[PDB]
Ligand binder design. Structure first.
Ligand code: A1CJ5
Length: 167
């Protein structure tokens, strides 16, 4: 039994809510919050910019040290860093950015990173400004993630569309 509230159950292990992931993280303080990162961990906009802003830029400072040491992530890859004031850990996951020309088949690989963690608060990878079909992303999520995932969808109209079209 945990502290997530108001989530709609989609499957045995996937739950969904129309919510700002930052506000959910502040309220729940989960073990793992997922960031929709890019390979450079440059947290400018979207989920990443919003999470980083809520950490007072500490996420960016930590991320720059990570990249200076290790180089960039792969599309489809991830790294575990601090969750700062928002969570114990942040799992930075790189879904493909279709607007940048990245391979949509890598979305499944991106979601596979979630399976290394028992419970996650996460956004809908590759949706919105990353340019992929969000209905497809939700289907890949449900068909790939086996651990317990609480999805926070920011856009209200999108949430309603995802629920109403879910198979
Ligand atoms: O509208 C949506 O859900 C899709 C969108 N999500 C957000 O931008 C978002 N989600 C939750 N809390 C948030 N707080 C501030 C922004 C924000 C998105 C776009 C690309 C990759 C993703 F993984 C998710």
């Amino acid at each position: 039994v945990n502290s997530f509230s108001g989530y709609l159950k989609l499957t045995d292990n996937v739950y969904i809510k129309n919510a700002d992931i930052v506000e959910e993280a502040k309220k729940v303080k989960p073990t793992v919050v997922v960031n929709a990162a890019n390979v450079y961990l440059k947290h400018g906009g979207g989920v990443a910019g919003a999470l980083n802003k809520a950490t007072n830029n500490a996420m960016q400072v930590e991320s720059d040290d990570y990249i200076a040491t290790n180089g960039p992530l792969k599309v489809g890859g991830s790294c575990v860093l601090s969750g700062h004031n928002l969570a114990k850990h942040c799992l930075h996951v790189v879904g493909p950015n279709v607007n940048k020309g990245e391979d949509i088949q890598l979305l499944k690989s991106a979601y596979e990173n979630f399976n290394q963690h028992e419970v996650l608060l996460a956004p809908l990878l590759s949706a919105g400004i990353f340019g992929a079909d969000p209905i497809h992303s939700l289907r890949v999520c449900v068909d790939t993630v086996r651990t317990n995932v609480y999805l926070a969808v920011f856009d209200k109209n999108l949430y309603d569309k995802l629920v109403s079209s879910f198979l």
